[PDB]
Each structure stands twice: as structure tokens, then as C-alpha cells.
């Protein structure tokens, strides 16, 4: 009964599936001790236990998402250089001014509308896409400065969205 039921799949097969459990944590422990700068400078032995006891320090020093908006913002801005812009339904006046608008300060986005920051050739490709719950279109925004084609696209069982007054388009922009 212990031929292949306890020796080949009871110990061997298990030993292969329960030994790595102790090598991955030590790996992570060694993989986590390095990140902690206050644990590597120890007399030839970062203690594999204090690697976590003091690790709570940085775990303490540093709810929605473990990353911060400025991170994701800089993250997406680093992803494909995407800035967030929120204009009105038809008014054309931009509501939000994105802090990663490095495709050009708020001089043109504060008063002038989006139509002012694009090329007039968008006479139709910039109004039809305005008011499919989500719009996909590649308008011609300018700010040499006229060739930064920006491809924009924006908008379980949930009806509305408890948030500020946002009946308009909120999309991104990436050099495509």
C-alpha cells in the first residue's frame, strides 16, 4: 500500500511540492531583506528573522490601491505618455488640467477649449465623437509643433457612479 502511494507520491512527490515552500520564503526573505536598507548592514549575517521583524518598519513607515495617484499618473505618463483631460459635452471648455501634460502649461488649457489646442482640420473628427458609451478617435492636437497625433479614447452591473458632476468625455492621449 506504501509502494507508490506513500514513497513515490507520499514523500518523493510531496518533498518536491513542500520543499520549495521553504525555499521561496527564504528567497522572498532574502528577496525582502535587500529592499530593507536598515537590514543589509549587519556583521556578515542579515538575520533571516529580523529581516521581517524590522521589515515592519518600512511596512509601517511607508486602502484603495497600494500605489498612489501620482505614481499611476507618473506610471501611465511613463507607460505611453498619457495625460488626462476632461472637457464638457459640447461647450468645449476643459474641466480638468492634467499635471503630466508634457506631450505647454495651462495658458492654453485654462481659458481656451480643446478645439483651440487641436488643429482646425478636426472640424468634424473633433465634434462628432462628442455628444457607444466610450469614444475612440484620433484628433489632431498641436500643443514643428503640428505633428503630435494623439489617439484618444474615453467615456459589473452598476447603473450610475456616485461622483462629481461628470456628464462629458474623460479620455487619455498617447503618441500613436
Amino acid at each position: 500500500q506504501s509502494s507508490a502511494d506513500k514513497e513515490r507520491l507520499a514523500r518523493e512527490n510531496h518533498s518536491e511540492i513542500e520543499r520549495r515552500r521553504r525555499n521561496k520564503m527564504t528567497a522572498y526573505i532574502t528577496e525582502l531583506s535587500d529592499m530593507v536598507p536598515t537590514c543589509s548592514a549587519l556583521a556578515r549575517k542579515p538575520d533571516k528573522l529580523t529581516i521581517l521583524r524590522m521589515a515592519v518598519s518600512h511596512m509601517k513607515s511607508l486602502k484603495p490601491s497600494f500605489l498612489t495617484d501620482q505614481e499611476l499618473k507618473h506610471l501611465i505618463l511613463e507607460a505611453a505618455d498619457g495625460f488626462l483631460f476632461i472637457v464638457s459635452c459640447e461647450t468645449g471648455r476643459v474641466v480638468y488640467v492634467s499635471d503630466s501634460v508634457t506631450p505647454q502649461p495651462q495658458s492654453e488649457w485654462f481659458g481656451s477649449t480643446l478645439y483651440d489646442q487641436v488643429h482646425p482640420d478636426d472640424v468634424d473628427k473633433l465634434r462628432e465623437q462628442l455628444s457607444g458609451s466610450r469614444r475612440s478617435f484620433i484628433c489632431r492636437m498641436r500643443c514643428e509643433p503640428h505633428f503630435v497625433v494623439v489617439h484618444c479614447t474615453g467615456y459589473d452591473d452598476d447603473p450610475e457612479a456616485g461622483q462629481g458632476s461628470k456628464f462629458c468625455l474623460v479620455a487619455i492621449g498617447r503618441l500613436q
Partner: protein, 166 residues
């Protein structure tokens, strides 16, 4: 008794983890240590050193997929749990092939070694076979267009990309 002095530390880091309380403690012992390492590196996403002498989450729904050089993930979109049938913490740190097709694993491997400093090809774009949650067919061919970076044993090549459907 020292073999129990750890859980007193784990319940801390588990509670010291940026995730909702609804399913916070659903993390296994290796899940916390896995997520415990996938967050501190975020601390140094950009700058946690100094040697050299909000509500902005509207873009995630209007769509961010991070990748490393050792064939594992660094950060999964905070909205990659609705367009895809899984959660962020479940694979926020595990290898990418665990969610990529078989014959297609060689494609992602070549986008880093044979590719690589803002020059050809700093920003790549291609299709591939991705996994699916089931009301699904088990794979989706997203369009991964990444922008290579130098995220900070010297630094290695990172990947700041955003994948979308086909």
C-alpha cells in the same frame, strides 16, 4: 514558542498592506511575503533615494501593465480585474507566462533581450496570446505597446506598457 512569534509579524504586514478589509486576510502566508516584496519596490518606483548632489484614477477605467526583466510582474492595473476575470494580488508578482499562452512565451522573452536610450525600439507594439478567466474562451489577443524604461547589481531594463483588447 518562537515558531509562533512570526504570525504576530505576519498579521501586521498583512494589516499593513494597502488592500480593502473585505478580502484583506484572504492572503496566504506566501501571498503576503509575495505582496510584501511587490510593494516596497513601488516605494522606489521612481525615487526613494537621494545620493545625487488624489482622484486621478479615471484613466484606468478609460483604458497599465508593468513587467520586469526576470520574467515576472511588478504591478498590475488597478482596473485589470474587471476587463480580465482575475484579481491584481493573485498574479501581481508571479511570472507572466503563468498567464500567457504556450508557444507565445518565446515572443515576450524576445522583446527584452533582442530589443535592448529613447530610440528603436523604445516604444514597441504587438499582439500575443493572453489568458482569460467562465463566459470566455480562455485567451485574449491584447495589443501590448510598451515603453521601455530604466526602473530603479546595476539597473536592468523595465517595461511600462498598457495592454488593450483586439
Amino acid at each position: 514558542r518562537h515558531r509562533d512569534r512570526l504570525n504576530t509579524e505576519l498579521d501586521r504586514l498583512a494589516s499593513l498592506l494597502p488592500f480593502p478589509q473585505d478580502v484583506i486576510n484572504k492572503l496566504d502566508k506566501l501571498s503576503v511575503l509575495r505582496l510584501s516584496v511587490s510593494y516596497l519596490r513601488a516605494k522606489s518606483f521612481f525615487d526613494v533615494a537621494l545620493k545625487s548632489t488624489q482622484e486621478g484614477e479615471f484613466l484606468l477605467q478609460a483604458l497599465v501593465l508593468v513587467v520586469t526583466a526576470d520574467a515576472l510582474v511588478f504591478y498590475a492595473s488597478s482596473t485589470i480585474q474587471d476587463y480580465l476575470g482575475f484579481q491584481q494580488s493573485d498574479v501581481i508578482h508571479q511570472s507572466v507566462y503563468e498567464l500567457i499562452h504556450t508557444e507565445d512565451r518565446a515572443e515576450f522573452q524576445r522583446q527584452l533581450h533582442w530589443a535592448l536610450d529613447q530610440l528603436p525600439p523604445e516604444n514597441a507594439s504587438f499582439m500575443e496570446r493572453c489568458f482569460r478567466c467562465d463566459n470566455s474562451s480562455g485567451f485574449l489577443a491584447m495589443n501590448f505597446q510598451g515603453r521601455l524604461k530604466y526602473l530603479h547589481l546595476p539597473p536592468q531594463l523595465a517595461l511600462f506598457a498598457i495592454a488593450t483588447p483586439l
